[PDB]
Amino acid sequence: DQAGITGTWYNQLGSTFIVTAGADGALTGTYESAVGNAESRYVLTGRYDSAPATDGSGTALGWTVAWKNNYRNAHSATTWSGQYVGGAEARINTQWLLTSGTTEANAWASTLVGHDTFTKVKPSDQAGITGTWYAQLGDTFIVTAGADGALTGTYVTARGNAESRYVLTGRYDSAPATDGSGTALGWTVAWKNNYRNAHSATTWSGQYVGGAEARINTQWLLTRGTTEANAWKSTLVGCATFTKVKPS
Amino acid sequence: DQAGITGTWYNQLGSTFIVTAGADGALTGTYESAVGNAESRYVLTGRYDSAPATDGSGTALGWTVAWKNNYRNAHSATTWSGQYVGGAEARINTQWLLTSGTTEANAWASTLVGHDTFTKVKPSDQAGITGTWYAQLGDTFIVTAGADGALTGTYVTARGNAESRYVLTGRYDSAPATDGSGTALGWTVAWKNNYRNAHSATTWSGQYVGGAEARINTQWLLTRGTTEANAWKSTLVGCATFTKVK
Structure with missing residues (x-):
């Protein structure tokens, strides 16, 4: 609500x-x-x-x-x-x-x-991140990293109850460490657009690694809206790796 | 304790x-x-x-x-x-x-x-699973699947605060579905042996998939003993995939 x-x-x-x-x-x-x-x-x-x-x-x-x-x-x-x-x-x-x-x-x-x-x-890496990313599953993530740490874009998922593009929003560390650490980031997609409503949302949390084989390595949580009796089984967990190269 | x-x-x-x-x-x-x-x-x-x-x-x-x-x-x-x-x-x-x-x-x-x-x-015993498995990190999981759904063996980890073998125990579904679904299983390692005590334990939960390239695909939780004040940061999460070929 x-x-x-x-x-x-x-x-x-x-x-x-x-x-x-x-x-x-x-x-x-x-x-x-x-x-x-x-x-x-x-x-x-x-x-x-x-x-x-x-x-x-x-x-x-x-x-x-x-x-x-x-x-x-x-x-x-x-x-x-x-x-x-x-x-x-x-x-x-x-x-x-x-x-x-x-x-x-x-x-x-x-x-x-x-x-x-x-x-x-x-109670009591802006340039490196911005662009199109491809998961191992075949779906696609287009994102713009703002200079402020904003992430904005659209997610197109090759699997699940999903169809066409969904809005995504997130944040990233806009001043990462220089010692070769990756850049922490995360984002959310609510699985509702003009065509489908899966009554669910996913967040990915992970880090961007630049260079010749740039990757975003993430873990994700997918929560479904449930009754209170079913809430114990409302959240799936997984990992996903995104690359700039579209897979086979 | x-x-x-x-x-x-x-x-x-x-x-x-x-x-x-x-x-x-x-x-x-x-x-x-x-x-x-x-x-x-x-x-x-x-x-x-x-x-x-x-x-x-x-x-x-x-x-x-x-x-x-x-x-x-x-x-x-x-x-x-x-x-x-x-x-x-x-x-x-x-x-x-x-x-x-x-x-x-x-x-x-x-x-x-x-x-x-x-x-x-x-408040108010799988021939498929038994054997040696190798993770993408380099460490090694030797396990025996009992006929009753028991898993017993040793885990040798290639990363973290660990060295040599640690005891593992777990369970698996001994009567899986025959529609081609994987076989659910999980197991635990407490990171204490005669050489090290990392004051932590990891549980892997996942499923065994058989055939030409058998795999165990898992997700894991690693909890460290912490003070009450640090408990919110006590648990790491990750994924690991094990194969029969090194």
Whole structure:
């Protein structure tokens, strides 16, 4: 629900995020984290299902924060993937992936995973990235990396309940480390366009590695809006690798 | 933590598991699930760090349940990876991976992810799998699949804080589907042996696909024992693909 989502949400750690849900499925806002290498507000962007199911399922959504602002750069990004559940005790229940830019030797250790629950009640490489990317599955990701750390574009998926292009939005570390680490980034796609609504959203969290064989290596979370009884099985997890060379 | 871990644990869904922690780092017991395609008890096996850190960190552990018993076969396995925290309100905080055996075309949708918290107080044999497997990183997994769905063996890791062999235990679906879906399975390694103790455990959850190029395609969770303040960053996630050819 657009009115249900917009506002201020608090999670179990004490972090805060303020979000505006646009009528078109956009999420925009700021996140302030009570833990980790973080200080003050960080830009957040994401998507949500603007036509959720009426059988009582939650509303699938996700969003991304690149942990760079004017005070700090943690060379990392987090994506939350989850669902909004309305009512007197409204909640956003998520799982998240936190990727650090790493050397290729430490990439196997690059991604933390966790869960966050948010309530309305306060508790007690721009050039390298911009362009067209191809997954091992055959689908396609066209993205523009802004100078501010914005990612914007469209995703065309070769598999699943999906058809034609979907809007994508995300963030990336716009001042990566120079020691050969990759560039942390993430983005979200809500699987609703003018042709289909799969009542679901995916977030990819990962890092860009430049050079002769440039890659975006990601892990992803796909959450479906579910009833509360089915929520334990609402989130799929996977990995995906994108290259600039269209596969065979 | 042998005495602390052993006994009966309840999670927020109403599921129950009973476990015995052995002195060597073994976990053995049964899991009864309050949700999903499950009914009565299922065998569980796993590992835990039998010499945790004394600074107050939790105790890393993991375990596997293949969702097949004499009453049902859900063609699936779950691994929980997490850490035991002792004291007046002892808990086991986990994240879990549930893999279903799927066709190749559906494999991208094969693995659910979630989190479970357990407390002590109740709330209100495949010839295909057995052998040596090699990951894209260079490390090595030697396993014996028992006829009862047991997995036992040793894991030798080519990366991280590890050296030589570590004990592994796990489970697999011993009566898979014959439509060409993979065989669901999972296993645990606690990263402690006679040479190193990394105070951590990894669980792989995934599926075995047979034939000319047999593979085990997995996703894994690596949990480190942490302080309560650092618990939010205790678990790494990744994927690993194993083949029979080095």
